Paper text:
[name]-box proteins are widely distributed in different life forms, ranging from bacteria to human and constitute the largest RNA helicase family. They are involved in many aspects of RNA metabolism, such as splicing, mRNA export, transcriptional and translational regulation, ribosome biogenesis and RNA decay. [name], a member of the [name]-box proteins, containing a disordered N-terminal region, a [name] domain and a Helicase domain, was identified as an intracellular DNA sensor in myeloid dendritic cells (mDCs) by Yong-Jun Liu’s group. They showed that [name] directly binds DNA and STING via its [name] domain and triggers activation of signaling mediated by mitogen-activated protein kinases TBK1 and transcription factor IRF3, resulting IFN production.
The crystal used for data collection belonged to space group P21. One asymmetric unit consists of two molecules of the protein based on the calculated solvent content of 44.15%. The hDDX41 [name] domain consists of an α/β fold, which is similar to those observed for other members of the [name]-box proteins for which structures are available. The overall structure consists of ten α-helices (α1–α10) and a β-sheet formed by eight β-strands (β1–β8). In agreement with this prediction, results of the static light scattering analysis indicated that the [name] domain exists as a monomer in solution. The structure of [name] [name] domain solved by us contains motif Q, P-loop, motif II, motif Ia, motif Ib and motif III. There are many interactions between the different motifs, which probably stabilizes the overall structure. The P-loop presents in a half-open conformation. Although ADP or AMP was added in molar excess to the protein prep before crystallization, no electron density was observed for these ligands. The [name] domain protein can bind ADP and AMP but not ATP in vitro because of the steric hindrance.
Numbering used by the authors: 157 to 398
Write the structure that this text describes.
């Protein structure tokens, strides 16, 4: 409980909450498969950022998390890499069937953030496959794609979905996607999402979970409004600030 604070102070990591898992200074010690480690080098990513150092082990242990981190902090790997791992184990335990809804869900304010994060997921998923792991399937639920097209992407079952709140809500209400097996919900740029009026749509999306989920909220800012929303959204979260 003693050296971990030295790690944190050095990399300017502020944490709140109980039973915080130890920070980890290397991707290998976070027990990632080598195909992912190679993907990281191959993208020039040799060393974990502060948000990754404390964030990844927090997520891996199943804790809810509030991440106060900015665009460019490396936050995207914090919420993409662990769920890919989670999905990989589920698919190995029981291969996903044709319509089995998403296991992991990532909600973004905008179409372009959604595509970009979806793009990242498909990169790591592809490297796993090229190591003989099964294909994990990543779906986009954003505006500008038809209904037909949306149902096409998920006909094979979907492990991970990246959505904007409006389109996802509509699909849930129309029973075209289900959250019956969704165990992981990441909220990216939550501050922006609140500023844009998506609060209600997101609370509605919440009501489509039957039973526990791990929830993650990422926000560049933590004013009183985001703080109250986070308290209602998450369960005993570890708060991590860089
Ligand atoms: Mg961002």
């Amino acid at each position: 409980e003693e050296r971990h604070e030295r790690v944190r102070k050095k990399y300017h990591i502020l944490v709140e909450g109980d039973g915080i898992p130890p920070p980890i200074k290397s991707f290998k010690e976070m027990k990632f498969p080598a195909a992912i480690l190679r993907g990281l080098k191959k993208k020039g990513i040799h060393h974990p950022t502060p948000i990754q150092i404390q964030g990844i082990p927090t997520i891996l242990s199943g804790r809810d998390m509030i991440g106060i981190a900015f665009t460019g902090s490396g936050k995207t790997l914090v919420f993409t890499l662990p769920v890919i791992m989670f999905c990989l184990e589920q698919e190995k335990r029981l291969p996903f069937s044709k319509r089995e809804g998403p296991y992991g869900l990532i909600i973004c304010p905008s179409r372009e953030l959604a595509r970009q994060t979806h793009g990242i997921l498909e990169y790591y998923c592809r490297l796993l496959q090229e190591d003989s792991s099964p294909l994990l399937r990543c779906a986009l639920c954003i505006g500008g794609m038809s209904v037909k097209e949306q149902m096409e992407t998920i006909r094979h079952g979907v492990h991970m979905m990246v959505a904007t709140p409006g389109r996802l809500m509509d699909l849930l209400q129309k029973k075209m996607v289900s959250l019956d097996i969704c165990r992981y919900l990441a909220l990216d740029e939550a501050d922006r999402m609140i500023d844009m009026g998506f609060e209600g749509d997101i609370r509605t999306i919440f009501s489509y979970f039957k039973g526990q989920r791990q929830t993650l909220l990422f926000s560049a800012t933590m004013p009183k409004k985001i703080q109250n929303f986070a308290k209602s959204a998450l369960v005993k979260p570890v708060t991590i600030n860089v």
